[PDB]
């Protein structure tokens, strides 16, 4: 027993050993919510080990914090103020966390901070389903590459709510990520070391972005578990539990064209630069870009309200028939920006139907755009 209102040590750690685990728990914290404790981060100590946790009632993220024992504990404190205080401390400063009633005390150097706390019993915890429909794992580098290859085709806040997340599907030993807004679609696939029955979830966009942040060890793997309408990702000592979008995702098989005959391969960087140049003198709101395809030449033309016109040409290894096709230049530019390969293969049918973007000798990536009539 100690005298009442005596400062009791709960934690001590070097600055980075505390700030680094915290930085995994701010992309989900909503700085001004209707629940005050939703703006807080939960710190739990048990047997000398620390866990940091945060939630938005949709994504619950936890990770192992620094070490330090002294009496198994649970606190919650304002995430933004605590992270700002940690970030304002010197590079290797030693931080000491004390508790006295409803106050938390940071001591570091010649600096005191008297933050406030909220009860841990009031912190909402996600109820993790105990039924797992599938469990698998894959390298974080491959998964991050796939996510970057598909996460630019989602529709942000469409009335069709299922077209907001990313379709993650498992069948046999194949993992597929499909994203589609209304007009465009991106598809990535890879092999996995399991034999799982076909299952699918629709990851929310915020979950996709947080998962993209989480994948920071290229050589380590990440494990994905498909609960009953929940998903649990685990890697780098960090666990993410996320709600899913409830609905039927569109069948992407009828989407993909199969008979595009005008095929040519061209430099990704050169085409992206040409599109960026010609988009300058295009209309700034809807961005109609016309592609003229003739043997050995691809021309990109744009115009705007002020009767101004921009036109670039690229020499290509093409011999088939001519084709004039319109596009929304944003869809063309997004794939060239998010793909890091040297060359890209463009397949056209007619100016009324889908155009296929692929990476040569890479059967695991597909990108489909349908044209406008400009």
């Amino acid at each position: 027993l100690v005298p009442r209102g005596s400062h009791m040590l709960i934690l001590q750690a070097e600055r980075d050993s505390l700030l680094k685990p915290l930085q995994a728990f701010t992309g989900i914290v909503e700085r001004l919510h209707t629940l005050p404790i939703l703006s807080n981060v939960l710190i739990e100590g048990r047997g000398g080990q620390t866990k940091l946790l945060a939630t938005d009632l949709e994504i619950q993220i936890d990770t192992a914090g620094p070490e330090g024992g002294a009496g198994d504990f649970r606190i919650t404190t304002n995430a933004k103020k605590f992270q700002d205080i940690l970030r304002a401390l010197p590079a290797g400063a030693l931080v000491s966390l004390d508790w006295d009633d409803n106050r938390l005390t940071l001591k570091a150097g010649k600096s005191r901070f008297a933050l406030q706390t909220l009860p841990a019993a009031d912190f909402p915890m996600m109820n993790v389903g105990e039924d797992i429909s599938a469990t698998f794992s894959l390298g974080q580098e491959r998964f991050k590459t796939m996510l970057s290859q598909v996460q630019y085709s989602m529709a942000v806040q469409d009335i069709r709510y299922y077209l907001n997340g990313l379709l993650m599907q498992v069948e046999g030993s194949q993992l597929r990520l499909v994203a589609t807004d209304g007009h465009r679609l991106a598809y990535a696939a890879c092999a996995i070391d399991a034999d799982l029955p076909r299952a699918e979830v629709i990851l929310p966009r915020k979950t996709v972005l947080e998962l993209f942040k989480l994948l920071n060890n290229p050589d380590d793997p990440i494990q994905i578990e498909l609960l009953d309408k929940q998903v649990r990702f685990q890697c780098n000592g960090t666990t993410i539990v996320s709600k899913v979008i409830d609905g039927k995702f569109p069948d992407f098989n009828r989407v993909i064209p199969l008979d595009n005959d005008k095929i040519f391969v061209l430099s990704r960087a050169e085409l992206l630069g040409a599109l960026e140049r010609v988009s300058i003198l295009a209309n700034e709101k809807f961005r109609g870009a016309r592609l003229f395809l003739q043997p050995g030449l691809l021309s990109v033309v744009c115009s705007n309200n002020e009767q101004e016109e921009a036109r670039e040409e690229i020499e290509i290894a093409y011999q088939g028939g001519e084709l004039e096709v319109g596009f929304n230049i944003g869809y063309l530019m997004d794939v060239l920006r998010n793909i890091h390969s040297d060359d890209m293969q463009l397949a056209f049918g007619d100016a009324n139907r889908s155009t296929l973007f692929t990476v040569p000798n890479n059967p695991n990536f597909k990108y489909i755009v349908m044209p406008m009539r400009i």
Partner: protein
């Protein structure tokens, strides 16, 4: 210098801009950002043959009372000429596969359904076809005005305006002078 230029609050559903030489003004709403934003649709109907349209990938099926194909199958040239393109996937089910980009945001079902019943005629030249398309394909009731485009929206609406667009008979911008504000202070 420019007449009718400011940006003030847009409290909840009626935009306000007050710098027009000591005379405050008020924009109606998106009701103005749809009437003025779609008279340029009539001005673009003459620049090219048909309204610029985007295909879709995934077609959208809807209810289509009485299949509304008495106005779609026969009137396919004009319907495609004003942006929309629909196919008859099955009985009493209509699937849109191309829609005008000047609608832009979403919900092509509403546009298709409230334009299919409008063109049931036969003069042959119906300007009202545009008007209906204007009433919902614009800034929708939702997020407040963008301050970067707060004054810009009013300036652009006035630039292509037609001097009391009168979509509803109500003047969009209602003059109210400094002397009128002083007078309305009932003493």
């Amino acid at each position: 210098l420019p007449p009718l230029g400011f940006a003030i609050a847009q409290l909840l559903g009626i935009y306000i801009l007050a710098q027009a030489e000591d005379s405050l003004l008020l924009i109606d709403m998106h009701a103005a950002a749809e009437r003025v934003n779609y008279e340029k649709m009539k001005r673009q109907r003459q620049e090219n043959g048909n309204l610029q349209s985007q295909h879709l990938l995934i077609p959208v099926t809807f209810a289509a009372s009485h299949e509304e194909c008495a106005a779609l199958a026969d009137h396919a040239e004009t319907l495609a000429g004003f942006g929309l393109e629909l196919s008859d996937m099955g009985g009493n089910t209509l699937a849109v596969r191309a829609a005008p980009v000047m609608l832009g945001k979403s919900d092509v079902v509403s546009l298709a359904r409230d334009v299919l019943g409008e063109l049931a005629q036969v003069a042959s030249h119906e300007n009202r076809i545009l008007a209906t398309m204007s009433c919902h394909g614009s800034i929708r009731a939702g997020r407040r005005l963008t301050l970067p485009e707060m004054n810009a929206l009013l300036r652009d609406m006035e630039n292509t305006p037609r001097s009391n667009q009168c979509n509803h008979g109500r003047p969009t911008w209602v003059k109210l002078t400094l002397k009128e504000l002083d007078t309305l202070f009932l003493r």
